[PDB]
Curated annotation (Swiss-Prot), chains A, F, I, K, L:
It is a single-pass type II membrane protein. The gene is pufB. Pfam families: LHC. This is Light-harvesting protein B-875 beta chain. It comes from the Bacteria.
Swiss-Prot record, chains C, G, H, J, M, N, O:
The chain crosses the membrane at residues 9-29. The core complex is formed by different alpha and beta chains, binding bacteriochlorophyll molecules, and arranged most probably in tetrameric structures disposed around the reaction center. The non-pigmented gamma chains may constitute additional components. One of its GO terms (cellular component) is plasma membrane light-harvesting complex. A bacteriochlorophyll binds at H25. It comes from Cereibacter sphaeroides. It is a single-pass type II membrane protein. Its main location: membrane. Belongs to the antenna complex alpha subunit family. This is Light-harvesting protein B-875 alpha chain. One of its GO terms (molecular function) is bacteriochlorophyll binding. The chain holds residues 8 to 49 of 58 of the full protein. Antenna complexes are light-harvesting systems, which transfer the excitation energy to the reaction centers. The keyword Repeat does not apply.
Curated annotation (Swiss-Prot), chain D:
Heterotrimer composed of subunits L, M, and H. Belongs to the reaction center PuhA family. The gene is puhA. It is found in: Cellular chromatophore membrane. It comes from the Bacteria. Its main location: membrane. Binds 4 bacteriochlorophylls per trimer. Binds 2 bacteriopheophytins per trimer. The lineage of its organism: Bacteria, Pseudomonadati, Pseudomonadota, Alphaproteobacteria, Rhodobacterales. One of its GO terms (cellular component) is plasma membrane light-harvesting complex. This is Reaction center protein H chain. It holds the Pfam family PRC. The chain crosses the membrane at residues 2-21. Residues 22-250 are cytoplasmic. Its cofactor is a bacteriochlorophyll; a bacteriopheophytin; Fe cation; Mg(2+). InterPro entries: Bac_photo_RC_H_C, Photo_RC_H, Photo_RC_H_N, Photo_RC_H_N_sf, PRC-brl_dom, PRC_barrel-like_sf.
Swiss-Prot record, chain E:
It comes from Cereibacter sphaeroides (strain ATCC 17023 / DSM 158 / JCM 6121 / CCUG 31486 / LMG 2827 / NBRC 12203 / NCIMB 8253 / ATH 2.4.1.) (Rhodobacter sphaeroides). GO terms for cellular component: plasma membrane. It is found in: Cell membrane. This is Intrinsic membrane protein PufX. It comes from the Bacteria. The chain holds residues 2 to 58 of 82 of the full protein. GO terms for biological process: photosynthesis.
Length: 48, 281, 42, 250, 57, 48, 42, 42, 48, 42, 48, 48, 42, 42, 42
C-alpha cells in the first residue's frame, strides 16, 4: 500500500528504519573499511 | 556444588541479547557467555607451551620459546616459531584476558555488586598490552617484544636491560616504583587491620572502629578511616603500571638511548649553567 | 521507499563496490613496474 | 650453610600454606549445602575447620563462626530444574518474594554498637553536631527514579562520627511512612537528583525502618539490597529502558 | 500514552517521539565528547590523513 | 515443586529413569569399549 | 508534473553521475605520466 | 530427561567439537616435519 | 506451575522424539561420518 | 529455533569464519621458507 | 513464545524458512567461497 | 559570560544547544578573524 | 545537560584560543623555512 | 559434614591416584637402569 | 555569571599575567641577541 506525500514512500517513518541500518551504517562501515585499508596501501608501494 | 546460602542467588540472565543460552554453572566455576569462550581460550593455550617445544628446541617450559618477529620485516608477519607462531599466542592471551574481565559482568548484572571490577584487571589489560601492541608497531616491526617464557624473558630484562644505561634514572619508572613498594606498605597494616580483636591475645572483648581510632591515630598521624585504605589498596596496585607504561611509551620508541644520560637535562640551568659544583665539580 | 531496500542495496550495492574494486585490481595487480608479488625470482 | 639445603625447608613448610590458609578463608559459607537444605556434594580439598571461640564487641553472646547456616529466613524460588545446576525462578514478581538479585537475612534484635554506649547510624535530627547557619544551604531537594520521573524529596542526612561519613539519604514521603536507600550508587550533578536503579513507583516496597533513627543489623540487609534487585531484571524489554539502562559511562 | 504492559507506546503522532529521545538519553555522548573524541585527535588521525599526494613522488 | 531435606535431590524416579540411564553411557563406552580400542594396542606395539 | 518523484528521481541521480564521473575517471587514468601514483615511474 | 533440547543440544556440539577438533588440528600442525604444507621445507 | 513425576520438563511424549532425534542422531550424523571421512584421513599421512 | 539464526549465525558466524581466517594468516603468510611477495630484494 | 514439539522451536515452518536461506545456502555458497579458492593456493606456491 | 541568559545550566533541550555554539558561535568572533590571516599564509611561507 | 557550565565551560572560551594559538606557534619559532621573526638580524 | 562422599570419586579421586601416580613415573622411567619403555631393541 | 568575579578579574587576573610575564623573561635572561641591559659598559 502506498500513500501521498514525500517521500511516501517513504515510507515515513520507513525512511528512518531502513535507510539507517544499511544505508548509513552500511556506508559508514563502508567508510570504516575503505579508509583504513588505504593506510597500508598509499605508500606501500606507489613509492618505488 | 554450591554454598549453603547460595540458594536465593541462583537466577538466570546476566548475559545480554540472545538469552540464557550460555550460563550453565559447571561446578564451583561460572560458565557464562564468556565462560565457554575462556574454555575455548584455555584449551588452545596449553598447546602454545608445547608447539615451539619441537621447533625452537626443549620440551620443558624452562627454556620453551616462541620468539617475537624481527625488527624490520614491516607491518606484517614473520617466520614461525620466531614470530609467526608467536603472532597467534597473543590474541588468545588477550582474547582470554578479555573473556574473563567481562564474564564478570554476567555476574555483575546478574546480582548488583558494583562495576569497579571489570576495571582492576583492565590495568592488567593496559599493562600487558604495552609490551605486545603499544611498542613494536611503529619503530619497524613486531620485533620489539618480549618472549613468553619463565626463564627466557628473564635473561631478556637484565643483561639485556641496560640499553638505556640504568633504568633507575627513568623518573616515572622510579615513580611507578614510588607507587609499587607502597602497595604492600598498605596491605601490611590493612591485612592486619582486621585480625586481632576477636583474637586480641586470647579471651578479651572484641574491638570496634573506635579502637581503630586509638591504634592508628596512635600510629602514623593519619586515619582516613576504614574506607580510606580500600581507597588505600586500589591506590597501590593499579597505577604502578600506567607510570610504567608511561616509562616505556617514551622509552625506546623515542629514547632508545641512555636514560642515565637524561640526568644531565637537570644540571643545565642559566643560573648554575657554566658551574661545576659538587661531585660534578 | 525513496529507493528499494531488499532489491537495490542488499546485493546490488554488493556489485557496486565489486564493480569498482576488481576493474582496478587489473590495474594495480598489473602495471609493468610494481608487482611486488610476481618479480621475486627474476 | 650450603648451596643445596634451604630450599627444602620451604618446598614443605609452605607447600601447605595454600592448604592452611584456604581453610581459614573457608570458615564462613561452608559447609556446602544443596538447593533445598541438604548435606551437599562435599567441601573441597581444603575442608572447613571446626571453629574457635568468638568473643563479641558488645556482649552479643557465644556466636561461634561459622555460625547459623540453616534455613531460617524465607526463600521463594520455584525449582525449575530439580537437577543441581540449572537456575531457579521466583513465584509471582521477583521483588515481592525476595529471591534473585535482592538479598537479605534474619538476625538478632541488637543494632551495631560502638563504644560510647550508643548506636552507630543516626539522622541529623538525632545529632545536633553540625547544622545550617550561613548563606543558603542545600539539605532539601527533589529527586528522580529510574523510570525517569520524580520520586520524592530528601531533606536530611544520617550522620557519622568515627568515619565522619554518610550511609543513607532519608526521603520525606507525602505521608511519612519510613523508607531507605543506599549511598554509593547515587549520581547527583546540579539541582535535581537522578537514581538509575528503581522506578519512581516502586519505592514504598522498601521497608519502613522500624525506627526513623535506628537501624538494627536485622534491617540493614534488604534496605541495602532492594536496589541490587533492580540491577538484574530491569528492564525488559523495548524502548525507553534501552536508552536508559544500557550505554552510559560511569 | 500507556499500554499497561510497559512504559511506552506503539506509534501515535503527537506526544510520542515529541520531546523525548533526542532530549535526555544520550546527552552524555556529546558532553563527554569534545575532549575524548576530539582531544585524542590532534596528532594521530592527522598523522595518517595527509599521506595522499606528498609521499607520492 | 521444591524440596527441603536430605538427600533430595535426588530423587525418584527422577533418579531411576534418568541417572541410571545416562551414567553407564560414560561407564561403558569407556570401560569395556575402551578395551576394544586395546585391540590395536596390546599387540601394537609393546613387543618390538 | 508527470515524470517520477517516488521513482525516477533517486535513480536518475545514482547511475547518471556514476555514468559521467567514474567512467570519466578512466580518461584521467589514461595518463601514465600524470596519474596519482605513476609519477614515480615517469 | 531434563537437560535441554530446544536450547542446549545443538550448541553443546557446535563449538564443543570446535573446542575439540579445530584446536586439535594445532597439534598435527605443531610438526613442521610432517604437516600437509611443511613437508617441502624439511 | 511445576509438576511432580518423571520427570519434567519434559515432555512425554518426548523420550523418543526429543532425546533420540537430536540426541541419538549424533551417534550417527558424525559418529559414522567419521568412519567414512577417516578413509581419507587415516592414510594421510602416517605412512611416508 | 533449534539453532538461533539471527544470533549464532549472522554476526557470530561472520566472525566464526573470521575465527579461522587470520590466525592462519600468521602461519601460512609466515613460514620461514615461503613468502613469495616479501623477498623482492634478496 | 514457544511450543513443545521438535524442533518447535523450530519453528515449523520457520525451521525451514530461517534455516533454509542462511543455513543451507549458507554452508553451500561458503563451500563455493572457501573451496574454489583452494584451487589457486594448493600449489602457488606451497610447491617451493 | 557564557552563551545566553539566566541561569545556565540549563537547560533542556541542551547539548543540542550548548556544544554547537561554543565552537562556531563562540568562534564566530574568531573564525572571521581567522578567515583573513590565512590567505597570506597560502604563499608565505609554505613555499620557501 | 551532562556538560558543566558554571565550572567547566567558562574556561573553554577565554583561554582555548590562547592555547591553540601559541601551542601551534611553539614549533615554528626557530625553523629553516617560514621564520618571519628572527629574520630581524640583517 | 567433615567428610562427604558422592562427588570426590567422579572428578577428583580419578585425578588423585593419577596425581599419586604421575610424580612417581618420570623418575623410574628415567633411572640409570630401569626405564622400561624406550629400550627394547638392543 | 557562572564563575566568580572577584576571583578572576581583580587579583587572579593579575596572576593571569604575574607568572605569565615572569616566564617570558625567564627565557631571555641567558640570551645575547637581545639582553639590552646585561652589558652597560660603553
Ligand atoms: C636492597 C638494595 C638497596 C635498595 C633497592 C631499591 C630499589 C630497586 C628501589 C629502591 C627504591 C627506594 N628505596 Mg631502596 N634499597 C635498599 C633498601 C632501602 C631502605 C632500607 C634498607 O631500609 C630504605 C629506607 C630505602 C629507600 C628507598 C626509597 C627512597 C625508594 C622508593 C621506596 C618507595 O617507593 O616506597 C614508598 C614509601 C615510602 C615511605 C617512600 C616515600 C619517600 C619519598 C617520597 C621517596 C623519596 C625518593 C625520591 C627522593 C623521590 C622524591 C620524593 C618527592 C619529594 C615525592 N631503600 C637497599 C639499600 N630501593 C625505589 C626507588 O624509587 O629508587 C630510588 C626502587 O626502585
Ligand atoms: C635493568 C633493570 C631495571 C628494570 C628492568 C625493567 C624492564 C625491562 C621493565 C621494567 C618494567 C617496570 N619496572 Mg623495572 N627494572 C628494575 C627493577 C625494578 C624494581 C626493583 C625494586 O628492583 C621495581 C619495583 C621495578 C618496577 C617497574 C615498573 C615501573 C615497570 C613494571 C610494569 C609492569 O610490570 O606492568 C605490566 C603488568 C602486567 C604485565 C600484568 C598484566 C596481567 C595480565 C593481564 C594477566 C596475565 C595472566 C597470566 C598470563 C596467567 C598466569 C596465571 C596462571 C593462570 C597461574 N623495576 C631495574 C631498575 N623493568 C616494565 C616496564 O616498565 O614496562 C611497562 C619493563 O618492561
Ligand atoms: C583537477 C581538476 C580537473 C577536473 C576533473 C574532474 C573529474 C574526475 C570530475 C570532475 C567533475 C566536475 N567538474 Mg571538473 N575538472 C576539471 C575541469 C573542470 C572545469 C573546467 C572548465 O576546466 C569545470 C567548470 C569543472 C567542473 C566540474 C563539474 C561540472 C563536475 C562536478 C559534477 C557536476 O557535473 O557539476 N571541471 C579540472 C581540469 N572534474 C565530475 C563530473 O564529471 O561530474 C559528474 C568528475 O567526476
Ligand atoms: C603571518 C604569521 C603571523 C601570525 C599568524 C596568526 C593567525 C592566523 C592567528 C594568529 C593569532 C594570534 N597570534 Mg599570531 N602570528 C604571528 C606570530 C605570532 C607569535 C610569535 C611571536 O611568533 C605568537 C606568540 C602569536 C600568537 C598570536 C596571538 C596573539 C593571537 C591569538 C589570540 C588568541 O589568544 O586566540 N602569533 C605572525 C605575525 N596568528 C590568532 C588570532 O586571534 O588573530 C590575531 C590567529 O587566527
Ligand atoms: C612391568 C611394569 C609395567 C607396569 C607396572 C605397574 C604397577 C605395579 C602398577 C602399575 C600401575 C599403573 N600403570 Mg603401569 N606399568 C608399566 C609402566 C606404565 C606406563 C609407561 C610409562 O610405560 C604407563 C603409561 C602405565 C600406566 C599405569 C597406570 C594406568 C596405573 C597407575 C594407576 C593410577 O593411575 O594411580 N604403566 C609397565 C608396562 N604399573 C598401578 C595400577 O593401577 O595397577 C595396575 C600399579 O600398581
Ligand atoms: C613396577 C612395580 C613397582 C612399583 C611402582 C609403582 C608405581 C608407578 C605406582 C605404584 C603405586 C603403588 N605402589 Mg608400588 N611398586 C612396587 C612396589 C611397592 C612397594 C614395596 C617396596 O613393597 C610399596 C610400599 C609400594 C607403594 C605403592 C602403593 C602406595 C600404590 C598401590 C596402590 C595405589 O595405586 O594407590 N609399591 C614395585 C617395586 N608403584 C601407585 C601409586 O603410588 O599412586 C597411586 C603408582 O602409580
Ligand atoms: C596493575 C594490575 C595488576 C593486576 C590486577 C589483577 N590481576 C587479576 C585480576 C586483577 C583485578 C583479576 O581479577 C584476575 C584474577 O583472577 O585474580 C587474581 C587477575 C589475574 N592475574 C593473573 C596473573 C597475573 N597478574 C599480574 C599482574 C597484575 N595484575 C598487575 C600487577 C601478573 C604479573 C606478575 O605480571 C600475573 C602473572 C591471573 C592469575 C588472573 C587472570 C585470570 C584470567 O583472566 O584468565 C584468562 C586466561 C586464560 C583463560 C588462559 C588462556 C591463555 C592462553 C591459553 C595462554 C596464555 C599465553 C601466555 C603467554 C601465558 C603465559 C603466562 C606466563 C608464562 C607469563
Ligand atoms: C612486608 C613488606 C612491606 C612493608 C611492611 C611494613 N612497612 C612498615 C611496616 C610494616 C609492617 C610498619 O609497621 C611501619 C609503619 O608504621 O607503617 C606506616 C612501616 C613503614 N614503612 C615505611 C616505609 C617503607 N615501606 C617499605 C615497603 C614495605 N614495607 C613492603 C611493601 C619500604 C621499602 C620498600 O624499603 C619503605 C622505605 C614507613 C612509612 C613506615 C616506617 C615508620 C618508621 O619507622 O618511621 C619512624 C619515624 C620517623 C623516622 C620520624 C622521623 C622523620 C624524618 C626521618 C625526620 C625529618 C622530618 C621531620 C618532621 C623534620 C621536621 C622538623 C619538625 C620537628 C618540625
Ligand atoms: C588504618 O588505615 C591506614 C592504612 O591501612 C591500614 C595504611 O596503610 C596507611 C599508610 C599507607 C600508605 C602510606 C600508602 C599510601 C601510598 C601512596 C600515598 C602512594 C604514594 C605515591 C607516590 C609517592 C608517587 C608520587 C608520584 C609522583 C610525585 C609523580 C607524579 C606523576 C606525574 C607528574 C606524571 C608523570 C608522567 C610521565 C613521566 C610521562 C612521561 C611522558 C613523556 C616524557 C612525554 C595509613 C596512613 C592509614 O591510615
Ligand atoms: Fe582490610
Amino acid at each position: 500500500a502506498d500513500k501521498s506525500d514525500l517521500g511516501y514512500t517513504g515510507l515515513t517513518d520507513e525512511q528512518a528504519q531502513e535507510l539507517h541500518s544499511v544505508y548509513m551504517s552500511g556506508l559508514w562501515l563502508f567508510s570504516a573499511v575503505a579508509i583504513v585499508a588505504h593506510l597500508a596501501v598509499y605508500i606501500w608501494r606507489p613509492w618505488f | 556444588a554450591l554454598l549453603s546460602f547460595e540458594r536465593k542467588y541462583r537466577v538466570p540472565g546476566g548475559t545480554l541479547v540472545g538469552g540464557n543460552l550460555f550460563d550453565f554453572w559447571v561446578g564451583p566455576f561460572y560458565v557464562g557467555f564468556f565462560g565457554v569462550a575462556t574454555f575455548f581460550f584455555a584449551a588452545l593455550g596449553i598447546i602454545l607451551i608445547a608447539w615451539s617445544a619441537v621447533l625452537q628446541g626443549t620440551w620443558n617450559p624452562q627454556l620453551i620459546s616462541v620468539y617475537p618477529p624481527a625488527l624490520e620485516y614491516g607491518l606484517g608477519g614473520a617466520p614461525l616459531a620466531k614470530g609467526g607462531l608467536w603472532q597467534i599466542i597473543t590474541i588468545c592471551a588477550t582474547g582470554a584476558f578479555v573473556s574473563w574481565a567481562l564474564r564478570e559482568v554476567e555476574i555483575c548484572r546478574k546480582l548488583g555488586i558494583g562495576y569497579h571490577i571489570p576495571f582492576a584487571f583492565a590495568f592488567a589489560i593496559l599493562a600487558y598490552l604495552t609490551l605486545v601492541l603499544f611498542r613494536p608497531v611503529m619503530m619497524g616491526a613486531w620485533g620489539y617484544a618480549f618472549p613468553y617464557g619463565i626463564w627466557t624473558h628473564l635473561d631478556w630484562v637484565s643483561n639485556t636491560g641496560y640499553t638505556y644505561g640504568n633504568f633507575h634514572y627513568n623518573p616515572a619508572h622510579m615513580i611507578a616504583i614510588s607507587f609499587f613498594f607502597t602497595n604492600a606498605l598498605a596491605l601490611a597494616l590493612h591485612g592486619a587491620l582486621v585480625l586481632s580483636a576477636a583474637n586480641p591475645e586470647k579471651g578479651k572483648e572484641m574491638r570496634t572502629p573506635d579502637h581503630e581510632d586509638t591504634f592508628f591515630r596512635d600510629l602514623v598521624g593519619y586515619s582516613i578511616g576504614t574506607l580510606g585504605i580500600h581507597r588505600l589498596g586500589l591506590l597501590l596496585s593499579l597505577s604502578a603500571v600506567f607510570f610504567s607504561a608511561l616509562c616505556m611509551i617514551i622509552t625506546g620508541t623515542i629514547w632508545f638511548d641512555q636514560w642515565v644520560d637524561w640526568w644531565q637535562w637537570w644540571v643545565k640551568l642559566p643560573w648554575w649553567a657554566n658551574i661545576p659544583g659538587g661531585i660534578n665539580g | 521507499w525513496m529507493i528499494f531496500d531488499p532489491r537495490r542495496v542488499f546485493v546490488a550495492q554488493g556489485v557496486f563496490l565489486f564493480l569498482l574494486a576488481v576493474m582496478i585490481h587489473l590495474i594495480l595487480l598489473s602495471t609493468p613496474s610494481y608487482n611486488w608479488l610476481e618479480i621475486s625470482a627474476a | 650453610d650450603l648451596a643445596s639445603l634451604a630450599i627444602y625447608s620451604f618446598w614443605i613448610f609452605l607447600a601447605g600454606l595454600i592448604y592452611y590458609l584456604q581453610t581459614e578463608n573457608m570458615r564462613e559459607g561452608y559447609p556446602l549445602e544443596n538447593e533445598d537444605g541438604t548435606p551437599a556434594a562435599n567441601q573441597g580439598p581444603f575442608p572447613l575447620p571446626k571453629p574457635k571461640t568468638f568473643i563479641l564487641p558488645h556482649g552479643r553472646g557465644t556466636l561461634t563462626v561459622p555460625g547459623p547456616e540453616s534455613e531460617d529466613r524465607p526463600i521463594a524460588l520455584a525449582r525449575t530444574a530439580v537437577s543441581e545446576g540449572f537456575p531457579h525462578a521466583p513465584t509471582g514478581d521477583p521483588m515481592k518474594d525476595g529471591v534473585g538479585p535482592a538479598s537479605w537475612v534474619a538476625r538478632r534484635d541488637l543494632p551495631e554498637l560502638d563504644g560510647h554506649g550508643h548506636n552507630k547510624i543516626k539522622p541529623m535530627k538525632a545529632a545536633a553536631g553540625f547544622h545550617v547557619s550561613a548563606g543558603k544551604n542545600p539539605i532539601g531537594l527533589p529527586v528522580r527514579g529510574c523510570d525517569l520521573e520524580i520520586a520524592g524529596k530528601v531533606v536530611d542526612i544520617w550522620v557519622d562520627i568515627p568515619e565522619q561519613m554518610a550511609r543513607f539519604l532519608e526521603v520525606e514521603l507525602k505521608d511519612g511512612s519510613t523508607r531507605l536507600l543506599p549511598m554509593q550508587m547515587v549520581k547527583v550533578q546540579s539541582n535535581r537528583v537522578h537514581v538509575n536503579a528503581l522506578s519512581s513507583d516502586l519505592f514504598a516496597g522498601i521497608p519502613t525502618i522500624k525506627s526513623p533513627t535506628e537501624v538494627t543489623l536485622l534491617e540493614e540487609d534488604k534496605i541495602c539490597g532492594y536496589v541490587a534487585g533492580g540491577l538484574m531484571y530491569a528492564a525488559p524489554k523495548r524502548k525507553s529502558v534501552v536508552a536508559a539502562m544500557l550505554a552510559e559511562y560511569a | 500514552a500507556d499500554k499497561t504492559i510497559f512504559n511506552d507506546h506503539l506509534n501515535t503522532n503527537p506526544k510520542t517521539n515529541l520531546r523525548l529521545w533526542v532530549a535526555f538519553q544520550m546527552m552524555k555522548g556529546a558532553g563527554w565528547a569534545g575532549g575524548v573524541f576530539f582531544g585524542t585527535l590532534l596528532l594521530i588521525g592527522f598523522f595518517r590523513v595527509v599521506g595522499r599526494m606528498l609521499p607520492i613522488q
